[PDB]
């Protein structure tokens, strides 16, 4: 059957495997039939415009919805008591009770409270009316229209960029550093100085009056001559109220440091300074400006960029709660928990994605001859060593961390908490925005250490053994994703490199889970004033189960009761949806293909033999999902479940507290 | 998207409006043209669509509008219009010999329009569809109003 157009192997599959594998391979452009590197890069090029158009229409939706259905105005008036709103609920299924309960934040009808700090971010960058947002939205739809127009025009042979424009990666690297990053950085400082900071200081800047307005009275005279002094004018008084004349300074570039007290956020002036500095550094480096493999392999490129975006989004999460850059976001606890957990989980996805494409590189692109004695060749030279070391630090950190937590559990249970192995984080004290690191924090840090170790252990045993191993010397033959080599050599289930990404996603979720668990319990403790609770109970595992999971679940799971619904109903329900989704992942992770294939055989029999029903038949012979599809659907359920459950819990834990 | 003439001697320019992919997709898959439909089916879909559409002007705009009786007007009016179109199809088919010719937009129009058999089938469809359409739209108008 035609679909999938690109793969005749599949298109001639007489089964439902053709539809699944189609959708699974529909973006592995490399593997499409008759795909030359030229067309490959051109196709990829156009897809990226599609992606970006999506991101812009996504942002567009944010602004459109908050404008139309939000309470952004009411919130800018009372940003500490008004709950900000994400969008309207129209759902024919809600009962009157649930419409009433979701009728919140002084909204006429049922709404969803926002928890992306979008209100805070927009207030900070200057937006003050629904008009500013509506214009942002319509603008961003038009940007997306342009980006789509672009991908279309580009794939059109008129402007179809040949292999040249892509082979010029070095040019692209320098351009990214300066022409994109640097340029946009200082453009953003433009926005900050002209609109953000004014609107912060109570002065309305529209698009029609900023030509009129000058940011700094001394501005032009300072520009190009004694720029540093004039720019550092009267700094904004602590008295200053955000978006009011009261205590408004005039400085546009400063190094005041710390946080604006009203908003408990980094000074807009400090941010503008930061960005100006970042821009200068980036542009200078641009002007100033494994080679073989990186240019050769697009997998190497993504892998690198994913590991990059991995660390970047991790630091974004780590910094965006410690060093709030948005007004009132520090006070909005649910948003800050949500954003941290969000960005940390996306961090873990981008990280593991790095190692995934790592392994794809090692089975599709890495030629051992091509690079005689490169870093990668040396890495493989002593795989057994890199793995034995990662193994050891894993077994070590693991045995000891679990042992200590279990020791603490045992002695505390036996009613002798004195006997606990409480180790103080001395180096944390030395280094220390920074919150008290106790012996609890120590144990959890080591947990996270161990888990991150086992994750990299797995997703490197993957990318190293991808080429092969004693159990399967020639894996590169069979490729990245394949079921197994059969029950041949004691059994080879899960021997592929894809299987290592699969086995490591679990550890990535465990690791980020420990991270965000620690984050959220610590913060709930402080946000309730019972930081004592964390400090005392975080040292044995029953304390995590009793105080974190058991204790902060109560509100959420009372979201709907036989007595009635409250606003947390939708979260209680999502909480269960995530438990169900997670567990459903176990169906696919534990029950493997053969059981199902026998069962489905019998259903094919029953269908063919049932009068009236037999009148219709499949086009595609029903078959059980593939070995690997079982693993993949398992993992997507497990992951989706994991995320949805925890998202529900993060929201439901923090929301009642505030 | 540029204007070009398939068979340049024929008075038919391929344009983004008649020969585009999105357009050809829509037109060639409307129930007039959609492949593999019984003429009766073609008619039943055309009918349902039109009856349902036709209900609205009559119910909304007519002389007894606003009142409950407007819904009944809507349905009967739309059904009357459909009956008149049913007559038109019958008499048209009675005297028609002509077949839909292949065009820029529709390379394979088909025979369901173009044979007396086809038009009778289509008309039976169109009638049942149209009056059904109109009734459904009144039922839904009453439903939504009540809800």
């Amino acid at each position: 059957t035609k679909f999938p157009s690109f793969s005749q192997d599949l298109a001639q599959d007489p089964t439902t495997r053709r539809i699944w594998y189609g959708i699974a391979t529909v973006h592995d452009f490399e593997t499409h039939d008759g795909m030359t590197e030229e067309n490959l890069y051109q196709k990829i090029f156009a897809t990226h415009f599609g992606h970006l158009s999506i991101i812009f229409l996504w942002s567009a939706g944010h602004l459109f919805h908050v404008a139309w259905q939000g309470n952004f105005e009411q919130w800018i008036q009372d940003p500490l008591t008004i709950r900000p709103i994400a969008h309207a609920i129209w759902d024919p299924h809600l009962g009157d009770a649930a419409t009433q309960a979701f009728t919140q934040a002084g909204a006429s009808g049922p709404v969803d409270l926002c928890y992306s700090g979008l209100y805070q971010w927009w207030y900070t960058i200057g937006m003050r009316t629904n008009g500013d947002l509506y214009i942002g939205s319509v603008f961003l739809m038009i940007v997306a229209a342009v980006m789509l127009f672009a991908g279309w025009l580009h794939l059109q042979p008129k402007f179809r960029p040949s292999l040249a424009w892509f082979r010029d990666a070095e040019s692209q690297m320098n351009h990214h550093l300066a022409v994109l990053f640097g340029a946009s950085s200082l453009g953003w400082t433009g926005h900050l100085i002209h609109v953000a900071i004014p609107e912060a200081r109570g002065q309305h800047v529209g698009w029609d009056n900023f030509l009129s307005t000058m940011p700094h009275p001394a501005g032009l005279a300072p520009f190009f001559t004694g720029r540093w002094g004039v720019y550092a004018q009267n700094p904004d008084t602590a008295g200053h109220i955000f978006g009011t004349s009261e205590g408004a300074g005039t400085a546009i570039i400063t190094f005041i440091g710390g946080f604006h007290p009203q908003t408990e956020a980094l000074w807009l002036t400090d941010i503008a300074h930061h960005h100006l500095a970042i821009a200068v550094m980036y542009i200078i480096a641009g002007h100033m400006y494994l080679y073989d493999t990186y240019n050769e392999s697009l997998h190497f490129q993504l892998g690198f960029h994913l590991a990059a975006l991995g660390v970047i989004t991790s630091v974004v999460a780590q910094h965006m709660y410690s060093l709030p850059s948005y007004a009132f976001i520090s006070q909005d606890h649910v948003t800050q928990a949500a954003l941290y957990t969000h960005h940390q989980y996306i961090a873990g996805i981008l990280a593991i994605g790095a190692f995934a494409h790592g392994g794809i590189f090692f089975v599709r692109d890495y030629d051992p001859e091509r690079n005689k004695n490169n870093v990668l060749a040396r890495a493989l030279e002593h795989k057994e060593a890199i793995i034995s070391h990662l193994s050891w630090v894993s077994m070590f950190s693991g045995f000891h961390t679990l042992g200590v937590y279990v020791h603490n559990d045992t002695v505390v249970a036996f009613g002798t908490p004195e006997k606990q192995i409480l180790v103080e984080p001395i180096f944390a004290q030395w280094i220390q925005p920074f919150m008290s690191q106790g012996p609890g924090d120590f144990l959890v840090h080591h947990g996270i250490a161990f888990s991150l170790h086992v994750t990299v252990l797995i997703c490197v045993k993957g990318c190293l053994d991808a080429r092969g191993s004693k159990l399967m010397p020639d894996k590169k033959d069979f490729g990245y994703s394949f079921p197994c080599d059969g029950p041949g050599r004691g059994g080879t289930c899960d021997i592929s490199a894809w299987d290592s990404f699969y086995l490591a996603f679990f550890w990535m979720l465990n690791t980020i889970g420990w991270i965000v668990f620690y984050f959220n319990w610590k913060h709930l403790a402080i946000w309730s004033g019972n930081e004592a609770q964390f400090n005392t109970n975080s040292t044995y595992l029953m304390g995590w189960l009793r105080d974190y999971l058991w204790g902060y679940s109560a509100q959420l799971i009372n979201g709907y009761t036989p007595f009635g619904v409250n606003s947390l109903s939708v979260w209680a329900w999502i909480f269960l949806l995530g438990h169900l989704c997670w567990a459903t992942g176990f169906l696919f992770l534990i029950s493997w293909r053969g059981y199902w294939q026998e069962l489905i055989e019998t259903l094919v029999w029953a269908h063919q033999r049932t009068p009236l029903a037999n009148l219709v038949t499949w086009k595609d012979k029903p078959v059980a999902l593939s070995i690997v599809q079982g693993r993949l659907v398992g993992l997507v359920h497990f992951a989706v479940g994991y995320y949805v459950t925890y998202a529900a819990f993060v929201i439901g834990a923090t929301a009642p507290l505030g | 998207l540029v204007k070009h003439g398939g068979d340049p001697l024929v008075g038919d320019l391929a344009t983004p409006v008649n020969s585009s992919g999105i357009v050809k997709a829509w037109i060639n898959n409307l129930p007039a043209y959609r492949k593999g439909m019984s003429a009766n089916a073609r008619g039943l879909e055309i009918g349902m669509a039109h009856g349902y559409y036709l209900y609205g002007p009559f119910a909304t705009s007519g002389p007894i509008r606003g009142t409950t009786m407007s819904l009944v007007s809507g349905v009967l009016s739309a059904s009357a219009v459909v009956i008149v179109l049913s007559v038109a199809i019958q008499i048209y088919s009675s005297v028609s010999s002509a077949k839909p010719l292949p065009s820029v937009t529709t390379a394979d129009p088909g025979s369901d329009f173009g044979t007396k058999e086809g038009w009778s089938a289509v008309g039976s469809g169109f009638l049942i569809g149209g009056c059904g359409g109109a009734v459904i739209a009144g039922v839904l108008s009453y439903a939504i109003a009540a809800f």
């Binding site: 599609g50 158009s53 229409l57 404008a67 009316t129 509506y134 739809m141 229209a145 279309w152 | 992919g21």
Partner: peptide, 29 residues
Amino acid sequence: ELSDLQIVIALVVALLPALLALNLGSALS
């Protein structure tokens, strides 16, 4: 606070990327 004129214009604009997405998608297929 957002008027119907504005809601409609927003929709009509959003229709543009819709058409162009159809176009780009077709291309990439």
